[PDB]
Design an enzyme around this catalytic site. Structure first.
Site, PDB file in Angstrom:
ATOM      1  N   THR A  26       0.842  -1.388  -0.148  1.00 38.37           N
ATOM      2  CA  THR A  26      -0.036   0.118  -0.003  1.00 38.37           C
ATOM      3  C   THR A  26       0.958   1.217   0.015  1.00 38.37           C
ATOM      4  O   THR A  26       0.296   2.408  -0.019  1.00 38.37           O
ATOM      5  CB  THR A  26      -0.921   0.026   1.143  1.00 38.37           C
ATOM      6  OG1 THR A  26      -1.819  -1.066   0.766  1.00 38.37           O
ATOM      7  CG2 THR A  26      -1.741   1.309   1.062  1.00 38.37           C
ATOM      8  N   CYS A  27       2.319   1.620   0.095  1.00 33.42           N
ATOM      9  CA  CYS A  27       3.314   2.660   0.000  1.00 33.42           C
ATOM     10  C   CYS A  27       4.412   3.138   0.702  1.00 33.42           C
ATOM     11  O   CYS A  27       5.448   3.067   0.118  1.00 33.42           O
ATOM     12  CB  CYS A  27       2.629   4.028  -0.034  1.00 33.42           C
ATOM     13  SG  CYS A  27       3.381   5.122  -1.338  1.00 33.42           S
ATOM     14  N   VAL A  30       5.844   3.025   4.159  1.00 38.29           N
ATOM     15  CA  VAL A  30       6.246   1.930   5.025  1.00 38.29           C
ATOM     16  C   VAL A  30       7.569   1.547   5.122  1.00 38.29           C
ATOM     17  O   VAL A  30       8.430   1.506   4.196  1.00 38.29           O
ATOM     18  CB  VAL A  30       5.343   0.790   4.406  1.00 38.29           C
ATOM     19  CG1 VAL A  30       6.130  -0.516   4.840  1.00 38.29           C
ATOM     20  CG2 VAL A  30       3.859   0.759   4.727  1.00 38.29           C
ATOM     21  N   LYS A  45       4.416   1.760   9.000  1.00 39.15           N
ATOM     22  CA  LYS A  45       3.678   2.591   8.133  1.00 39.15           C
ATOM     23  C   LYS A  45       3.186   3.732   8.869  1.00 39.15           C
ATOM     24  O   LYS A  45       2.732   3.870  10.060  1.00 39.15           O
ATOM     25  CB  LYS A  45       2.168   1.848   7.812  1.00 39.15           C
ATOM     26  CG  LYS A  45       1.311   2.788   7.349  1.00 39.15           C
ATOM     27  CD  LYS A  45       1.394   2.746   5.636  1.00 39.15           C
ATOM     28  CE  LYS A  45       0.054   2.341   5.191  1.00 39.15           C
ATOM     29  NZ  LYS A  45       0.084   1.410   3.943  1.00 39.15           N
ATOM     30  N   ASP A 130     -13.323  -4.166   3.820  1.00 38.22           N
ATOM     31  CA  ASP A 130     -12.332  -3.748   2.691  1.00 38.22           C
ATOM     32  C   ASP A 130     -11.648  -4.734   2.053  1.00 38.22           C
ATOM     33  O   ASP A 130     -10.440  -5.064   2.634  1.00 38.22           O
ATOM     34  CB  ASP A 130     -11.611  -2.459   3.072  1.00 38.22           C
ATOM     35  CG  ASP A 130     -11.063  -1.506   2.036  1.00 38.22           C
ATOM     36  OD1 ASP A 130     -11.896  -1.596   1.061  1.00 38.22           O
ATOM     37  OD2 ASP A 130     -10.019  -1.097   1.947  1.00 38.22           O
TER      38      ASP A 130
END
Length: 255
Positions: A26-27, A30, A45, A130
């Protein structure tokens, strides 16, 4: 306070030694960090604040199918959550491979995720809500896990716009997306078209297609509680069947 190894400590994020940045899940951004205090290595994160949680994952270490949370930090700007180190997102693999994912991996994966879903609902009465390929992680060990609790809402239940169980939907779509290697389909087809079941002749287990369908049932009420899903044959096969996931993963990554 950061807790690893079953003992709980404090805990400043500046406390932790830092190693390189890590990315592509997810980016996040992290981070890879090591906790001087016990010697462990972990992932951090970082998120910028907004106006103006999440204890629970921190509170579910008895699930081997949810990535574990070690604790949290807050500061003026961020906001940190610390968790166990892992290799990737499912979704990245999807993109990384171009090619699809073998029914076997999905089969084990499918099992793990459903059990993750089950745990929270009963144990913590949570609804993750989710479920998408982003949210599923795989490792060198070959473990499969969930966090946490071009459309984000593409995985939206058909119910859940009209009348005034979803996740299962989301699950189904992920499988179809992951299994086939193509996203399964803004929207508007979702509430309008035919649920995008697994291709009729792609080499997919009979057991599987039933799973994928049974999940994707349009009328929610008819739709399966996680409990049924567990009994269902595909799931059954895969608690048992032996799949060397790790050499696959460890292996997919050369490419």
């Amino acid at each position: 306070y950061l807790t690893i190894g079953g003992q709980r400590y404090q805990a400043e994020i500046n406390d932790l030694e830092n190693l390189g940045e890590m990315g592509s899940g997810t980016c996040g951004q992290v981070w890879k960090m090591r906790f001087r205090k016990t010697g462990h290595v972990i992932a951090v994160k970082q998120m910028r604040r907004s106006g103006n949680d999440l204890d629970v994952v921190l509170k579910s270490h008895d699930c081997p199918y949810i990535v574990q949370c070690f604790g949290t930090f807050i500061t003026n700007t961020d906001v940190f959550i610390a968790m166990e180190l892992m290799g990737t997102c499912a979704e990245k693999l999807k993109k990384r491979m171009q090619g699809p994912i073998p029914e076997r991996i999905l089969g084990k994966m499918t099992v793990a995720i459903v059990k993750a879903l089950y745990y929270l609902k009963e144990k913590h009465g949570v609804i993750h809500r989710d479920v998408k390929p982003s949210n599923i992680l795989l490792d060198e060990r070959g473990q499969i896990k969930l966090c946490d609790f071009a459309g984000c809402a593409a995985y939206m239940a058909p119910e859940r716009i009209d009348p005034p169980r979803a996740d299962v939907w989301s699950l189904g779509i992920s499988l179809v997306e992951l299994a086939t290697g193509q996203f399964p389909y803004v929207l508007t087809k979702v509430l309008q078209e035919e649920p995008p079941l697994l291709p009729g002749h792609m080499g997919f287990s009979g057991d599987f297609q039933s799973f994928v369908k049974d999940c994707l049932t349009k009328d929610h009420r008819k739709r399966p509680k996680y409990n049924k899903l567990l009994e269902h044959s595909f799931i059954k096969r895969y608690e048992t069947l032996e799949v060397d996931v790790a050499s696959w993963f460890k292996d997919v990554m050369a490419k």
